[PDB]
């Protein structure tokens, strides 16, 4: 898997990749 | 949260996975 920032829609689109089926949450910036 | 880990600093797939449901 990419040892490397995932920011933005590319860390969404890495969880909906790595979730799968089961779905994710993505929470409010501190 | 995800940002801070993910985006700020980097992630394991395993650190990923614990923002799956
Ligand atoms: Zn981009």
Not at chain 1, 1 to 23: I, P, T
Not at chain 2, 1 to 21: A, D, F, K, R
């Amino acid at each position: 898997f990419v040892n490397q920032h995932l920011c933005g829609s590319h860390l969404v689109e890495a969880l909906y990749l790595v979730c799968g089926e089961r779905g994710f949450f993505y929470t409010k910036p501190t | 949260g995800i940002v801070e880990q993910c985006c700020t600093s980097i992630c394991s797939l395993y650190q990923l996975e614990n923002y799956c449901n």
